Amino acid sequence: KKIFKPEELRQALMPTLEALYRQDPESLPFRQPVDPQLLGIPDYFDIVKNPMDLSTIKRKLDTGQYQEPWQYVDDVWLMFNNAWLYNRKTSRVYKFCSKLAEVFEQEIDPVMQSLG
Ligand SMILES: CCc1c(C(=O)NCc2cccc(Cl)c2)[nH]c(C)c1C(C)=O
């Protein structure tokens, strides 16, 4: 199988992560792990079993925790699916998530074509 070097993945994928961070107001609720106590939603971890957020994805990209590009895509989509699962369709986080997913699909496509 094609082996991806850590810096290869970082150079290719970090710009797609930065594109999500650039989204204001939509990325703000995703820039840090959900804190259910601070946010007053103690049921969060009862519903979301595998939390994910932009800062965790960034740390994983910085520490070589992705061996394949699709593992990175999986974490971004885990973040999205958590927000779509937990939040009501009318909520800001839900609609912001939908916007981030539109941005991400546009950014990741040419990058996947460039990668192996
Ligand atoms: C609703 C809770 C939530 C947040 C969040 O950050 N809230 C505070 C906030 C600050 C600024 C702007 C907004 Cl819209 C919300 N973040 C997540 C991923 C979620 C969930 C549960 O999924």
Side-chain angles (χ1 to χ4, degrees), residues 2-116:
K2 182 189 189 313
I3 304 181
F4 294 91
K5 295 178 179 63
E7 189 59 9
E8 176 182 3
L9 294 176
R10 216 180 59 88
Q11 290 290 326
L13 302 172
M14 196 61 75
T16 71
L17 192 60
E18 301 176 341
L20 297 189
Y21 273 93
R22 278 195 297 273
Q23 305 306 313
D24 189 319
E26 293 91 352
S27 75
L28 279 289
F30 300 92
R31 290 176 174 183
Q32 59 286 310
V34 177
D35 186 330
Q37 182 177 5
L38 170 75
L39 297 169
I41 46 169
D43 66 352
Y44 181 74
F45 287 149
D46 298 332
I47 298 170
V48 174
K49 295 311 184 177
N50 296 288
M52 188 53 60
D53 78 288
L54 294 176
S55 73
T56 299
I57 294 168
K58 182 185 182 307
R59 171 73 166 174
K60 290 181 73 170
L61 193 53
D62 288 334
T63 57
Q65 291 188 48
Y66 299 118
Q67 313 314 309
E68 315 284 337
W70 58 263
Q71 296 170 329
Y72 164 81
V73 176
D74 282 351
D75 265 347
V76 176
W77 271 86
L78 175 61
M79 184 182 70
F80 295 160
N81 278 321
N82 287 346
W84 284 322
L85 172 65
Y86 179 85
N87 300 280
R88 300 284 172 87
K89 313 178 221 186
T90 52
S91 66
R92 297 173 295 163
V93 169
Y94 192 104
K95 288 185 178 295
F96 289 178
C97 180
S98 288
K99 171 60 173 295
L100 292 188
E102 178 176 59
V103 171
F104 185 69
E105 81 167 358
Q106 295 172 7
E107 298 282 317
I108 195 60
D109 175 308
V111 173
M112 296 301 294
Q113 298 307 295
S114 74
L115 294 165

